[PDB]
């Protein structure tokens, strides 16, 4: 089946109110930039972002000029005339609105609190969907805390029920209304709801892993923000998942969650696959269409893993725009982030940047020998490995943040589409390398092994293997006399 290619499309409320397709200084990336050729390369466009107001219902930002909004949305839905598989989803949330200290956080916690609030919220979701002409709902709450998870799950189940009803009522059997969420792409935020992943993913068509922002000025040493695989020379992190309320034994926790570990895209994907009831087909790998920059770094390894002097303070202090060549950074008042479009232009300039490649993480990075600058980002080359990985692991597809950051020729989007569907692209020889793989093993990814059937009344020594209840077991110590699942001395290590 075709791999999903989900592009978030974000347009600031101020750009909506001043929408125009003839002045890039007002609207850098209007919808017209999405030609029919590009509409065909996408399977989903996630319009971002809608919020949840005080009436605990899905709603546009109060400052939004509604007529301008519908006009922009209508331009997006008009693109469906060029691609019968394309869906224009709308995303509820985002960091600004939903983070713990976000301007609308309480509305999220309250919307999912009760059956009544959940029914009211779900109905507003479907209402907004049919009202503006969207094709599905994406929930991007960053992020629900463990105590709000059961409500979160129930809310998703309710939206699922209403959407399936709407699909029938609207004869959309060919292009069913969908439900997805942007999920965490790193163990720390993932730990908030990890124990209930199976319940969270059940009502979804896809869980879009935000497998980016895994590095940034908020960390001590520079690092790749979306390394596919790990580099032993880079920093490692505490595996927060081992502290999840899973109810697993020490032995199970340790094998599923090695710590410290390399915070990579492969780690996030494997961490989801380790849980039972989380199908590979629903996992979507997120990739960034932007890079993160660090200043005051040291050479030696191209700027990688160096200490730096980048204000991790969000609303970038000073008007000191140290990110040379990045005119966009000036426009947006922040030299710590730049779109691939801007980065490409900085590279072809003579701003003193050198593009290097890390063959372990399979990602590029820029090093400014002078000024001491380092930029972690992704490009068409890193997307080759990520696309091959998506195919090998049988993931549902790729997602990205965000469409408006691609270059004018739409090279990053074209590359993703090419790697998945071009008849003349052949990656059978692409070498995935020796970067560190996340080796955690859990209930959802037990390996096939083979073992004799456990014999009741028999005593086995330490290390013995046996089959029982459709699984293969190993003894954690010696002189065992009870049965698997009935004696803590046995560790389930394989299936069939």
Residues belonging to the binding site for chitin are: 66-67, 93-96, 143, 210-213, 401
Report the residue number, 77 or 223, with the smaller CB distance to other proteins.
223
Least distance from C-beta 213 to other proteins, angstroms?
Answer: 6
Residue (11 or 179) nearer to other proteins, CB: 11
CA distance 311 to 318: 10
CB of 116 to other proteins, least distance (A): 33
- Where do we find the tokens 């949840």? 52
Q: What is the dihedral of CA 344, 296, 211, 83, to 10 degrees?
A: -20
Q: In the bound complex, what is the minimum distance in angstroms from residue 363's beta carbon to other proteins?
A: 19
- Return the axis-axis angle of helices 382-392 and 411-421, rounded to nearest 10°: 40
Which stretches of 86-135 are assigned E, i.e. beta strand? 87-93
Task: CB nearer to other proteins: give 163 or 399.
Answer: 399
Q: How many CB atoms lie within 10 A of CB 128?
A: 18
Residue 140: name the closest of 86, 174, 185, 74 by CA.
185
Structure tokens at 416: 């993703």
Which residues, at least 6 apart from 84, have a Cβ–Cβ distance to it below 8 Å? 175
Instruction: Provide the minimum distance between the beta carbon of 129 and other proteins in the complex, in angstroms, as a whole number.
Output: 25
DSSP code per residue over 234-298? S--B--GGGGSS----HHHHHHHS-SSB---HHHHHHHHHTSTT--GGGEEEEEESEEEEEES--
Compare residues 97 and 353 and give the one whose CB is closer to other proteins: 97
Residues that bind other proteins (CB under 8 A): 95-96, 99, 213, 216, 218, 314-315, 332, 334, 337
The H helix count followed by the E strand count for the chain is 15, 17
Q: Indicate the annotated binding residues.
A: 66-67, 93-96, 143, 210-213, 401
In whole angstroms, the minimum distance from the beta carbon of 311 to other proteins comes to 13
CB-based burial, 75-109: b 16+ in 10 Å, e otherwise: bbbebbeeeeebbbbbbbbbeebbbeebebbebbb
Residue closer to other proteins (CB basis): 58 or 337: 337
CB of 319 or CB of 350, closer to other proteins: 319
Contacts (Cβ under 8 Å, ≥6 apart) of 340: 289, 290, 291, 377, 378, 379, 405, 406, 407, 412
Give 469's contacts (C-beta < 8 A, 6+ positions apart).
Answer: 484, 485
Beta strands in 389-442 (DSSP E): 397-401
* Beta bridge partners of residue 88, listed in sequence order: 45
Least distance in Å: CB of 240 to other proteins? 17
CB of 125 to other proteins, least distance (A): 24
Cβ atoms of residues 291 and 340 within 8 Å: yes
Determine which one of 21, 57, 142, 381 is catalytic. Answer: 142
Identify which of residues 323 and 395 has a Cβ nearer to other proteins in the complex.
323
Is residue 142 part of the annotated active site? The answer reads: yes
Please list the active-site residues: 142
């Amino acid at each position: 089946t075709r791999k999903a290619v989900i592009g978030y499309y974000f347009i600031p409320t101020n750009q909506i109110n001043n929408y125009t397709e003839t002045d890039t200084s007002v609207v850098p990336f209007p919808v017209s930039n999405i030609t029919p050729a590009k509409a065909k390369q996408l399977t989903h466009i996630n319009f971002s972002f809608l919020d949840i107001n005080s009436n605990l219902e899905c709603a546009w930002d109060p400052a939004t000029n509604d007529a301008k909004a519908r006009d922009v949305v209508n331009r997006l839905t008009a693109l469906k005339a060029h691609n019968p598989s394309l869906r224009i989803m709308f995303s509820i949330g985002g960091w600004y609105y939903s983070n713990d200290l976000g301007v609308s956080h309480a509305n999220y916690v309250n919307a999912v609190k009760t059956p009544a609030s959940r029914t009211k919220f779900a109905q507003s979701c479907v209402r907004i969907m049919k009202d503006y002409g969207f094709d599905g709902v994406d929930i991007d709450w960053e992020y629900p805390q463990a105590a709000e998870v059961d409500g979160f799950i129930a809310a998703l189940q309710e939206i699922r029920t209403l959407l399936n009803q709407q699909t029938i009522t609207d004869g959309r059997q060919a292009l069913p209304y969908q439900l997805t969420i942007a999920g965490a792409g790193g163990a720390f935020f993932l730990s908030r709801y990890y124990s209930k992943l199976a319940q969270i993913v059940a009502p979804l068509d896809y869980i879009n892993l935000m497998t980016y922002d895994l590095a940034g000025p908020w960390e001590k040493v520079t690092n790749h923000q979306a390394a596919l695989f790990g580099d032993a020379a880079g920093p490692t992190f505490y595996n927060a998942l081992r502290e999840a309320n899973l109810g697993w034994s020490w032995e199970e926790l340790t094998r599923a969650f090695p710590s410290p570990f390399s915070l990579t895209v492969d780690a996030a994907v494997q961490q989801h696959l380790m849980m039972e009831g989380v199908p590979s087909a629903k996992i979507v790998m997120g990739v960034p269409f932007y890079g993160r920059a660090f200043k005051g770094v040291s050479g030696g390894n191209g700027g990688q893993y160096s200490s730096h002097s980048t204000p991790g303070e969000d609303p970038y202090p000073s008007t000191d725009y140290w990110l040379v060549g990045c005119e966009e950074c000036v426009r947006d008042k922040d030299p710590r982030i730049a779109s691939y479009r801007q980065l490409e232009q900085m590279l072809q300039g003579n701003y003193g940047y050198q593009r290097l490649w890390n063959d372990k993480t399979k990602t590029p990075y820029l090093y400014h020998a002078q000024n001491g600058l380092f930029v972690t980002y992704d490009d068409a080359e890193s997307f080759k490995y990520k696309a091959k990985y998506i195919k090998q692991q049988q993931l549902g597809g790729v997602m990205f943040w965000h469409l408006g950051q691609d270059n004018r020729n739409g090279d990053l989007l074209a590359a993703l589409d090419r790697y998945f569907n071009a008849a003349d692209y052949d990656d059978s020889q692409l070498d995935m390398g020796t970067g560190l793989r996340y080796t955690g093993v859990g209930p959802g990814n037990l390996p096939i092994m083979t073992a004799p059937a456990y014999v009741p009344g028999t005593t086995y020594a330490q290390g013995a293997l046996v089959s029982y209840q459709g699984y293969v077991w190993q003894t954690k110590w010696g002189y065992i006399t009870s049965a698997p699942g009935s004696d803590s001395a046995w560790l389930k290590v394989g299936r069939v």
